[PDB]
Scaffold this active site. Structure first.
Site, PDB file in Angstrom:
ATOM      1  CG  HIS A  13      -1.933  -1.147   1.144  1.00 16.98           C
ATOM      2  ND1 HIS A  13      -2.954  -1.224   0.225  1.00 16.98           N
ATOM      3  CD2 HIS A  13      -2.005  -2.280   1.883  1.00 16.98           C
ATOM      4  CE1 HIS A  13      -3.615  -2.355   0.398  1.00 16.98           C
ATOM      5  NE2 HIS A  13      -3.059  -3.014   1.398  1.00 16.98           N
ATOM      6  NE  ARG A  21      -2.190   9.505  -7.170  1.00 22.35           N
ATOM      7  CZ  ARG A  21      -2.590  10.609  -6.532  1.00 22.35           C
ATOM      8  NH1 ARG A  21      -1.925  11.752  -6.682  1.00 22.35           N
ATOM      9  NH2 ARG A  21      -3.674  10.581  -5.758  1.00 22.35           N
ATOM     10  CG  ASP A  22      -1.729   6.713 -15.911  1.00 22.91           C
ATOM     11  OD1 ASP A  22      -1.562   6.792 -17.141  1.00 22.91           O
ATOM     12  OD2 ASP A  22      -0.845   6.273 -15.151  1.00 22.91           O
ATOM     13  CE  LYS A  40      -5.033  -6.926  -2.165  1.00 22.68           C
ATOM     14  NZ  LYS A  40      -5.522  -5.528  -2.009  1.00 22.68           N
ATOM     15  CB  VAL A 103      -5.966   6.187   4.694  1.00 21.61           C
ATOM     16  CG1 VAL A 103      -5.754   6.888   3.373  1.00 21.61           C
ATOM     17  CG2 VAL A 103      -4.797   6.442   5.618  1.00 21.61           C
ATOM     18  CG  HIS A 114      -6.078  -4.141   7.661  1.00 18.28           C
ATOM     19  ND1 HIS A 114      -6.402  -4.948   6.587  1.00 18.28           N
ATOM     20  CD2 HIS A 114      -7.239  -3.570   8.063  1.00 18.28           C
ATOM     21  CE1 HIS A 114      -7.701  -4.872   6.358  1.00 18.28           C
ATOM     22  NE2 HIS A 114      -8.233  -4.043   7.239  1.00 18.28           N
TER      23      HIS A 114
END
EC number: 3.1.27.-
Length: 120
Positions: A13, A21-22, A40, A103, A114
């Site tokens: 992550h 960011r595409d 995933k 977040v 996590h």
């Protein structure tokens, strides 16, 4: 020091400075982080400074959230990669959604272990 889960968290992550960011970004990063065999379905990367992420584990940049999670006080640049199609096998096509918001994470011994992806 980085226990396995925190390290795992970073691999899955965290991307300090994403080159894009595409969709192609997602396709590349999911692959490099070994998240493509099988593909995933959805995975969000948080960008920026690692210490701010770690800080979510302290009142410094986080508040309790739910019954075992913490939500950041600060907003982060994030890129969610969502699998496009149905095949769980490469090539994994991804549609990237770039956002900027706080977040939610789960912390263990003061380290994020996590990412709750349910908010993306």
């Amino acid at each position: 020091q980085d226990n396995s889960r925190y390290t795992h968290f970073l691999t899955q992550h965290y991307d300090a400075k994403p080159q894009g960011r595409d969709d192609r970004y997602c396709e590349s990063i999911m692959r490099r982080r070994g998240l493509t065999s099988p593909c995933k379905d959805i995975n969000t990367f948080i960008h920026g400074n690692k210490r701010s992420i770690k800080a979510i584990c302290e009142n410094k940049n986080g508040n309790p959230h739910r019954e075992n999670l913490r939500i950041s006080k600060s907003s982060f640049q994030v890129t969610t990669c969502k699998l496009h199609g149905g095949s769980p096998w490469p090539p994994c096509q991804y549609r990237a959604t770039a956002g900027f918001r706080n977040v939610v994470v789960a912390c263990e011994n003061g380290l994020p272990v996590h990412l709750d992806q349910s908010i993306f």
